[PDB]
Design a protein around this ligand. Sequence first.
Ligand code: CA
Lengths: 50, 98, 38, 318, 98
Amino acid sequence: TTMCLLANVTFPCAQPPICYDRKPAETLAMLSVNVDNPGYDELLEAAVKC
Amino acid sequence: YKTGMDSPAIKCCGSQECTPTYRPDEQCKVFTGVYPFMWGGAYCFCDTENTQVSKAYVMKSDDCLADHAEAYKAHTASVQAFLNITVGEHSIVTTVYV
Amino acid sequence: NECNIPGNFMCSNGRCIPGAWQCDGLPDCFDKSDEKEC
Amino acid sequence: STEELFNEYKLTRPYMARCIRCAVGSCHSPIAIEAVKSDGHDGYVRLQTSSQYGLDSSGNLKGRTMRYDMHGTIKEIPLHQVSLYTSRPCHIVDGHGYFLLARCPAGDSITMEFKKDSVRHSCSVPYEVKFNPVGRELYTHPPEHGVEQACQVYAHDAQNRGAYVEMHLPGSEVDSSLVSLSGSSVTVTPPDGTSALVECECGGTKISETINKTKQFSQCTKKEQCRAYRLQNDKWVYNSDKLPKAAGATLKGKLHVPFLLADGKCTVPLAPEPMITFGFRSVSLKLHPKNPTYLITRQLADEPHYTHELISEPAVRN
Amino acid sequence: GAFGDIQSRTVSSSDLYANTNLVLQRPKAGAIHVPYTQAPSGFEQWKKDKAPSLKFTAPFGCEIYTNPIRAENCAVGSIPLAFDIPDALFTRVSETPT
Ligand SMILES: [Ca+2]
C-alpha cells in the first residue's frame, strides 16, 4: 500500500481530500509535494474526480 | 537521449548562482549582460547587471521502452536437440540435452 | 477484428479510425458504428 | 473512458513561445514547436507544440480543436483550419494535450500554420523529419499490397503509458498593455480576477503587489520605468526553455504523453521474382528491382563469404 | 557520438550514465531560450551504419532467433550416442523371418 501527503495526514492515495473542479491551485500544490511517489498515478486519477 | 532544459532563471539588477542537481551530464552556466523580451514587452528595466541561468541535462527518451538495444555478454553455450527416436518400433519425441 | 496499428478502432467496414474518435458525438464510420454503444 | 485521459491537461494552459521563422520575421508565436520526433516507420511523426488539443477554450472537451494562447486570452479554432507540411503537405490525425500526431513525408523542416480573419500565423523550425522504411526494400511511399512485417509506429490513441513530461509554475509573464499614463502620473490597471505586481525605479527602489485596482503611483513620470507583470497561481505550463520560471522549487507535477511508439504490423512490398539460371556449381541471378532492394547472399560453410548489396538497376549477379 | 553514449543499467534503472558532449551556449540578445550544442545520437548513428545481422552472416548456415538468444540447425560437428539397451528387447532368431 501507498500513503500520500498534504500535511502530516497520511491519507490513502486512492482517496484524496480535494478535487480540481472544486479548487484551482490547492490540488496542484498537493500534486507538487508528492511527485516522488510510486502511487502518483493513483493519486493523480483520484485527485481529478470526485 | 532527450536533452532536457530548465526554464531560464532571470533576475533584474541582481546576480544568480549555480545550484547543481547531479542530473546526468548536467551542465549549468550563468550569463550576464542580458536584456530579455517577452511577448508583452521587455522583461527588465535595467540595461546591464541582469542575469540569466541556463541549465541543461540529459535524460533518456520517452520511447525507450519499445525501442532500445540490449548489450549482452555470452560464453559457454548449451546444445539441446529435439530428437525423434525409434528403437524396436517404439517411438518417442523428446527434447534431449546433448 | 484488430487493426494493424494499436491505437485504432475498427469500424463496420474495416476502416480503422483513431481510438479517441469512438463515442465522441461525431459520425466517422459508415452507419455510425463509432456511435452505437456509449 | 476518454474523459479520464483528458483530465490532466485540464490542469494546464497553452502559452506563447519564440518561433524563429514566422510569417514575416522572428516573432512570439502561439503555435511554437518544441520538438519533432520521427522514429516510427511509415511516416507518422509526433509534434510537441505550444498549443493544446482536444480541449475547448474553457477546459471542457471539444472533439477536434486546437487551443492556443493569444496575448493572454485563450482562443480556439477547429482542427481542419490547421495545416502543416514538411516538403509535401502532412495530414493531421489526432491531438491530445500539447502533442499532435501527423502523417508526414520526409523533409528538413516543419511548418505549422493556421489562418484567422486577416492575420496568418506560422512557425517554421529547422527540425529534420525522416521517413523510415520497413524491410529490405527501400520505398518512399508505403505500398498497396505485399506481406506484413512487424514494425513500430506511434500509436493513435492517447492511452496512459509509462512515459512522462514535467509541469511547473508559470512565471511572471510581463505585460505593457496594463501600464498606461495618467495626465501627470503612471497608471496600472490589472485585469479582473487577476493580480499584477509592479516594479518601478522612479523614487528609490519601489515594488508593490496590487489586486483588482486601478492603482496610480506618484513620482513616476514616464511609463518606461515601470514593468507590470502578471500572475496565475493555477494553470500549469510545460517546463519550456522559451518561458521564464518562478521562484522556489518550481515543481507542481507530471503528465503522461500520448501517442507512444508501440509494436504493430506494417505492409511491405514484395520484389519481382528473380530469374535463376543454373549451371555446374554456379547460379546466375537476373534481377529487375522496382525500387531499391537489398540482395544478401552467404554460403553454408566455415567461411560464409557474405555479400551485401543495395541493387536499384536491372542487374545480373553470378 | 557512438553506441552507448547513454548507458542505463536496466530499462527501469533510474540511474543512467551519459556522456553526450553537451556544451551550453550564450543566448541571443533579446530572447529567452537555452542554447546548447552536443554530439548527435550515437544510437541513431549506430542504426545508420549497422553491418548486417547475424541472421544473414553466420557461418554453417545458422538461424539466429531472439526471445531465447539461440542459434538453430548449425550443420557442424557430430553427436555421439550411448544406448544402454536391456536384454528383454533382443528377440530370438526363429521368432523373425529368415
Ligand atoms: Ca465517432
